[PDB]
Design a protein around this ligand. Structure first.
Ligand SMILES: NC(=O)c1ccc[n+]([C@@H]2O[C@H](COP(=O)([O-])OP(=O)(O)OC[C@H]3O[C@@H](n4cnc5c(N)ncnc54)[C@H](O)[C@@H]3O)[C@@H](O)[C@H]2O)c1
Length: 315
């Protein structure tokens, strides 16, 4: 069975591999609704029980499609865990209490759910962090008390933005944090913040273990924000694996899964083959361990750009 890990103090047990549903909004090329449904059904059948989306992905399309996918499961509601977000929309950012209070109703309508398990502020580095602390999080606390979400959180790229918020709200205010692109073969800096997150009692969700396509055979999309030198070294690592009969995406995901202090790693998936590969990579990690010789050679290739990121937001 696919390993499950406790998520902070929420009592939720998430599969160590999570379903990133942003491709269901066509972020990484177009995908049919029938394929999306089959992909989620296969993910659930393989033991994945955690699904993450946002009103932003595909201008609310990802949520609509995921809502159809989850209905097609025909499963008990407590057998899967749904996370979505608020504050970032196709028409821009709005972290006001009025916006996010409307947003949860809009998301529940699209998702065809009475409640989500997790609701998080999306990309807070683009907002006023003082508004997040003093207006947005209180509004989310009222949404939680209404029952429309069970737990609340915050997401963003820069690791520093979390400390600003978590230092200023009372203990136990935030249930979960989602960080992305910082626990993968080229960037492990999320491990630097895990001691702080443990100190605040927050469950940690990692996302983008392929760093949004850097750790794939096809390579990153044209819009990927990483510098050319990050892209060149990631391509060299993928070419090394291809030359030696190795799967760069399998190894990248196995790297991200190896830290047990992270409850789940969301990986964007848009096909049943990707689900079969990614669950298989997780299962094989438990029974065969890691290919240490290839990881060491991958590390040597990525070393010059290790832990380099890119600017995001307005802080
Ligand atoms: N600020 C935030 O809150 C934030 C930011 C980014 C992502 N996320 C969440 O995290 C999810 C995952 O991140 P992501 O999708 O942007 O990047 P990712 O690292 O998960 O990679 C996704 C891309 O890799 C491809 N892929 C997946 N498995 C593969 C395989 N076995 N072989 C080859 N290719 C494979 C996917 O099709 C997609 O093109 C997202 O869907 C979303 O849910 C949140």
């Amino acid at each position: 069975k696919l390993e499950r890990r406790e998520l902070g103090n929420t009592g939720l047990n998430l599969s160590c591999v999570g379903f990133g549903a942003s491709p269901l909004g066509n972020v990484f090329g177009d995908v049919s609704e029938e394929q999306s449904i089959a992909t989620v059904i296969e993910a659930f059948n393989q033991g994945i029980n955690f699904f993450d989306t946002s009103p932003y992905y595909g201008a609310t399309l990802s949520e609509k499609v995921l809502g159809k996918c989850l209905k097609a499961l025909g499963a008990s509601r407590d057998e899967y865990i749904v996370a979505t977000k608020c504050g970032r929309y196709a028409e821009g950012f709005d972290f006001s209490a009025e916006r996010v209070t409307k947003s949860i109703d809009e998301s529940l309508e699209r998702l065809q759910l009475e409640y989500v398990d997790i609701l998080q502020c999306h990309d807070i580095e683009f907002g006023s962090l003082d508004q997040i602390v003093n207006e947005t999080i209180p509004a989310l606390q009222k949404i939680k008390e209404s029952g429309k979400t069970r737990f609340i959180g915050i997401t963003g790229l820069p690791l520093e933005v979390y400390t600003y918020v978590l230092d200023r709200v009372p203990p136990g205010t935030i249930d979960v944090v989602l960080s992305y692109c910082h626990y993968c073969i080229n960037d492990s800096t999320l491990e630097d913040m895990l001691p702080y997150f443990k100190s605040k009692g927050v469950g940690v969700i990692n996302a983008s273990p392929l760093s949004m396509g850097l750790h794939t055979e096809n390579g990153p999309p044209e819009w990927h924000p990483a510098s050319p030198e990050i892209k060149a070294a990631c391509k060299a690592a993928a070419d090394y694996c291809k030359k030696n009969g190795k799967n760069i995406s399998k190894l990248a995901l196995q790297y991200s899964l190896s830290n047990k202090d992270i409850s789940t790693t969301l990986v964007g998936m848009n096909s049943v083959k990707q689900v079969e590969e990614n669950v298989g990579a997780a299962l094989e990690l438990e029974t065969a361990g890691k290919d240490e010789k290839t990881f060491a050679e991958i590390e040597n290739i990525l070393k010059p750009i290790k832990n380099q990121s890119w600017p995001s937001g307005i802080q």
